[PDB]
């Protein structure tokens, strides 16, 4: 799993840093994911696995990994050619259920990303709206 293993290493290395995660570290993780593009399904799986299992403090950094990977891929391969956003979209409800287990004050950070994704057409609005609704529902509960 050479390319995937090197990606898993970069992803897991988040556990060795206290958030906020640096630009430099996010770039390293992102470059590893792009290099492993042949195995993009496995990369998406590893990110989702990480988000599912990580400590609450790493939920938002896990989302920043998705954002960073998706935006780099769109830049590098073309917006319509990017394989990562459509693949991340498949289990995105599950993913955000897990992300919303973050500390209370980190919920706003998730919404900021969602609003940027909508604004910049990173993901389809149809996909984004239930994710935003989920934020709001937890705010009332």
């Amino acid at each position: 799993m050479e390319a995937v293993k090197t990606f898993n290493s970069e992803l897991y290395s988040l556990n060795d840093y206290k958030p906020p995660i640096s630009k430099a570290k996010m770039t390293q993780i992102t470059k590893a994911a792009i290099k492993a593009i042949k195995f993009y399904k496995h990369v998406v799986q590893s990110v989702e696995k990480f988000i599912q299992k990580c400590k609450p403090e790493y939920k938002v950094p896990g989302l920043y990994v998705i954002d960073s990977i998706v935006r780099q891929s769109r830049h590098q391969f073309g917006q319509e050619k990017d394989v990562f956003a459509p693949r991340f979209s498949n289990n995105i409800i599950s993913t955000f259920q897990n992300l919303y287990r973050c500390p209370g004050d980190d919920k706003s950070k998730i919404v900021t990303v969602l609003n940027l994704w909508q604004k910049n057409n990173v993901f389809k609005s149809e996909i984004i709206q239930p994710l935003l609704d989920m934020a709001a529902a937890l705010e009332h509960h």
Partner: peptide
């Protein structure tokens, strides 16, 4: 310098 979703 920490990662931000707003920056290129």
């Amino acid at each position: 310098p920490s990662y931000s979703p707003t920056s290129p």
